[PDB]
Sequence to fold (1079 residues):
Amino acid sequence: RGNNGNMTFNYYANTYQNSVDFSTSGILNPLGYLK
Amino acid sequence: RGNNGNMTFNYYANTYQNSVDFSTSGILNPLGYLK
Amino acid sequence: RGNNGNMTFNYYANTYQNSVDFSTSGILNPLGYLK
Amino acid sequence: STDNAETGVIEANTDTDFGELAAPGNHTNVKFLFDRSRLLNVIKVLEKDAVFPRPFPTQEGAQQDDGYFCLLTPRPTVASRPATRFGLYANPSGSGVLANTSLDFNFYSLACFTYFRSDLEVTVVSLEPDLEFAVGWFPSGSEYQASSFVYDQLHVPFHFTGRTPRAFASKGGKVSFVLPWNSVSSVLPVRWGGASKLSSATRGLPAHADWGTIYAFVPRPNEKKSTAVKHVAVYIRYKNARAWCPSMLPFRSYK
Amino acid sequence: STDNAETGVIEANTDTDFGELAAPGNHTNVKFLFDRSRLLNVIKVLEKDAVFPRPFPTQEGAQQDDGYFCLLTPRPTVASRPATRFGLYANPSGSGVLANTSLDFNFYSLACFTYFRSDLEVTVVSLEPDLEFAVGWFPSGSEYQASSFVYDQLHVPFHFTGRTPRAFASKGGKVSFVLPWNSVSSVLPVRWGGASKLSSATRGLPAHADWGTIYAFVPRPNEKKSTAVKHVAVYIRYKNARAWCPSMLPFRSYK
Amino acid sequence: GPIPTAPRENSLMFLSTLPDDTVPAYGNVRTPPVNYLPGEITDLLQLARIPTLMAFERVPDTYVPYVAVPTQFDDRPLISFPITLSDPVYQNTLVGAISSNFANYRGCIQITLTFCGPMMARGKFLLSYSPPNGTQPQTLSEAMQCTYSIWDIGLNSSWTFVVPYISPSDYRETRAITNSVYSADGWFSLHKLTKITLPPDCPQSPCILFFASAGEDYTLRLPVDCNPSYVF
Amino acid sequence: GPIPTAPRENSLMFLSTLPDDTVPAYGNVRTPPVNYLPGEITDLLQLARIPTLMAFERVPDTYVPYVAVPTQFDDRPLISFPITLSDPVYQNTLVGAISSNFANYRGCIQITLTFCGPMMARGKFLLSYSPPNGTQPQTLSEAMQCTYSIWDIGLNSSWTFVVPYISPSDYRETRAITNSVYSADGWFSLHKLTKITLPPDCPQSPCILFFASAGEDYTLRLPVDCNPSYVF
Fold:
């Protein structure tokens, strides 16, 4: 996904590479529905 | 194939390394046939 | 064989590393035999 | 064919009237399009502890250090502060002080939505030959620490040390790193219509819509100040960008 | 032996008349032969925003910046534009402006077919000692963006930023990268006989038979222009090349 | 022990579009959730598929987005324009604005019309599409031979005309400079087949609105730089 | 933690023929298919195996590709030439042009002839091939001892002469400078065994066409640089 080519090895952990949201616990839909 | 020596590891993905055509869905042949 | 130390990994292919002859299809012998 | 566009929701090739259903052959994806570097702003380089600009309006005869620092945001900014009306000094020589301004032309050329969110990846490039420098950054809502301390009768600005990241690059080098989305607001409003304060506020001026702040300085004591100025360039990238609702596009003149 | 070559399709060693069937011992393969670098052209280095050359014919007294930019194609070119007749200025000093020209001698020495296609791998080498530069490129059918913007009273050319790739090399460095086949035409015509327009066209002049365009510039503001000129060299390579039909070879004089 | 290595020729280079990541500096940060926001976008084609309005020069700013039917005519279409996306008429439409930032396009353009006038009026119109030629067709007789259709005023006042995609190459350029066969693709025109009958007490001169958008098989390939002219 | 490493002595070097790839800059691009184009080439030997024409100085441009039989002769072959691929006669043939860009060759050259003249004529020719010697053989008596064959005019007017490959080394050089045994490989000659009988009312002087190509076991090994002389 995205303009990323590497597909073999990620060195740093995911948490330290990208932000993560904390839990609170082709086919394209149309942006308008007409009942 | 080609003047390429490496035969162990390709880092970047094939799609990002070479172009690909989109689908539309020794022994050497002679360039002249005489019926 | 030879003054080569590496014994774990060869990167480039053998054909591109050394020449190869094309097919045409301790104990030391003495250089003189006397019948 | 029969249709009714007044209702808004119109139906949906040549197979319908006369067909051709040319096979597919995803370069417009939001995640993919926005991943590439682009210039943001050009700033001076510090050589001593500086005094941050005062909030507007700034009266005549106020002592400060202007031209340094720079926000990290596509929205228009003035004097290193958030702004609404973009402007430039196309006029010839005048008086007073000229206010540095910035904007993301490429981003706004396709900013066709309202809300946005992504990670930012910063890098820095020098301009003058064989120049040595360093960078410092702090989150949104923080402040820049002033003053200096004495070591062996050398005045070292306080910004040499801190809990926030620092970067030292070799002679004629470059810097790069990726920061996290850290503002309090859930998403970045490309265009806004609210107010940030109960009274004396300005309509449509967001408060904390940015990624942080950046500055550049030389690793030397204050006792070795020079005369010639130096400059630095900045670039940014977006990672895993997302958009949340349609919008308009900039108007093109018919001249 | 008995045969009839007038029919064209002749039959096919010493085993047939007197044999010898020397065993094999693939250096002529199309894919393998064309994978090696070769010089293409030498160009100047920009130091400010430039004005692209106007389309032919160019009248006397037209202001522009010539000598920069360069196409990526083996076919002959003139003034950074596609051309048909290759030419050179072997004559002594004259008048007017001299038009830069280029051609791929090595490619055309074995260009024995009509249609060709492959990926291109570009690299750049400097000539003057301890020179700092950068490169920029855009696809076929695009245009070069002119004009400049002001940052802290420094005129920065617009080409510093863009969605197309940019490359910054360290002091006395080198550049390299591989681009994709991006022209609209399915394959590259080595020799052509059609016309690109319904009227006022020139026979045998292709429209978009290339890989793109390249230029070089210094990362400095326009307020630091110098006098001495600088030069840069360019090399290209072919990857996974293919050919599609026989053809002739260049004529050799019998002098 | 140390692992032998050999740096390549392009070390210490900076690429503005290299597909790779960078080392983190301030990682391990959490963010509030955004599951409450509806209407997430994934591809700009979703916005490209939305109709919008065009512009026209009007008689001697004057760029009204509609065309008014005259009373007397003279053997000539009411309005005609090329099919080059760089044309002024496509400037402010979403499809034109988005495409201007890409090199190659592919698919079928879509055009939609709508009538605005008295209910009890009547008339008939003819729509035409002429591929490239040596001269732009003018007369109704010429127009009829090419691809065309007939629009009749009735209960439904809207009609959609789909422009077929025919070209000698799989893709086509988005902006035209030389007007080569690779960019231009002919013309479109509107002809009044009959004379519009205005009912009594309805004053005169109805108007027509033009709606343009992208087809269901549109596509764009190569990104390019933008034009910051809108800032001045 | 950091992995120890040791850069070698040849770091930051640029090689014009290094067998390795490079980092992509603008990847993820699709292209139209080319399955509709017939006649794809794979190896240049396919083109090398095609006959072509030779050249000859002609009597005192004059480089007609044929040889005319005279009326009276004098104990000497009609035409003879070496077997060195750098010779002028091989310049414009495909085999010569291609081989000139390689160092070593290997295999059997192929020569083909064809007659052009009145139908009702008759004659007999002799073809010879003499390996290297101290002096080029001239007389028919000498020629006969070496490898040879006899060509008879009849229904079929074409004949192929295969030059055997004999040399002290597996490969041979492609261009000759010192004329050493490694490049030169003897001579070829054509002798008129009988006198050609021209039928009445057919004027005189038939002509012969020379066709040359590569054998079925040809081969080339080492690429080299080209000569741009053709541009001047």
